[PDB]
């Protein structure tokens, strides 16, 4: 499957793509404002994620980013450090693809995640979550942390599977109704035809 990753932000981002235990495609790349990078993701990929990283410095491809850092690598093999707005997908799962956007690991960069082929709609979280972020969730390194990252409670992290919405999750949900705001949120997952192709756009508006 092809994913065109487009940076419409006025600032550079370092795109990242991983399934947690492996890179997808090259795993990461710099995208200056306006640049597009097309990756290939193997059919059947389960639990893949694409995200933006901000304020990165890389030497051999080793360095640091202020949001979304994946163990200091330009080419991510693992998931990124919160806060990270997440484009999430599992492909060719019993004949269908499943996509969503998640704020469960916080928000750093606004994003649209849409199919480029027929049969389903896209999802978007493009509100100014960083600007509106509650004081207690603001990440000093940049972005808006989720409450699990900040407070490490069973309720925010949904550790027992028993959790409800919270004042913090409701903030993310108010700003972005079409993204997951906590682990047990009512799903905003979109079912697409198996083997669809996609575009992830940072700063779509």
Swiss-Prot record:
CDD domains: TLP-P. It holds the Pfam family Thaumatin. The keyword Disulfide bond applies. SUPFAM superfamilies: Osmotin, thaumatin-like protein. One of its GO terms (cellular component) is cytoplasmic vesicle. The keyword Glycosyltransferase does not apply. It is found in: Cytoplasmic vesicle. Coiled coil: none annotated. Keywords: Cytoplasmic vesicle, Disulfide bond, Signal, Taste-modifying protein. Disulfide bonds join 9-203, 56-65, 70-76, 120-192, 125-176, 133-144, 148-157, 158-163. Taste-modifying protein; intensely sweet-tasting. It is 100000 times sweeter than sucrose on a molar basis. Belongs to the thaumatin family. This is Thaumatin I. It comes from Thaumatococcus daniellii.
């Amino acid at each position: 499957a092809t994913f065109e990753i487009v940076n419409r932000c006025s600032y550079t981002v370092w795109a990242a793509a991983s399934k947690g235990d492996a890179a997808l495609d090259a795993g990461g790349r710099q995208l200056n404002s306006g640049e597009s990078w097309t990756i290939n993701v193997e059919p059947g990929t389960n639990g893949g994620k694409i995200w933006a990283r901000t304020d990165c410095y890389f030497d051999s491809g080793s360095g640091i980013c202020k949001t979304g850092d994946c163990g200091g690598l330009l080419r991510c093999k693992r998931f990124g450090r919160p806060p990270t707005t997440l484009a999430e997908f599992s492909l060719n799962q019993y004949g269908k693809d499943y996509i969503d956007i998640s704020n469960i690991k916080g928000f750093n960069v606004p994003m649209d995640f849409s199919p480029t082929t027929r049969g389903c709609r896209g999802v978007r979280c493009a509100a100014d979550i960083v600007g509106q972020c509650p004081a207690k969730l603001k990440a000093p390194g940049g972005g808006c942390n989720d409450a699990c990252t900040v407070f490490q409670t069973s309720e925010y992290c949904c550790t027992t599977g028993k959790c409800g919405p919270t004042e913090y999750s409701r903030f993310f949900k108010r700003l972005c109704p079409d993204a997951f705001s906590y682990v047990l949120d009512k799903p905003t997952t979109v079912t697409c035809p198996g083997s669809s192709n996609y575009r992830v756009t940072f700063c779509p508006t």
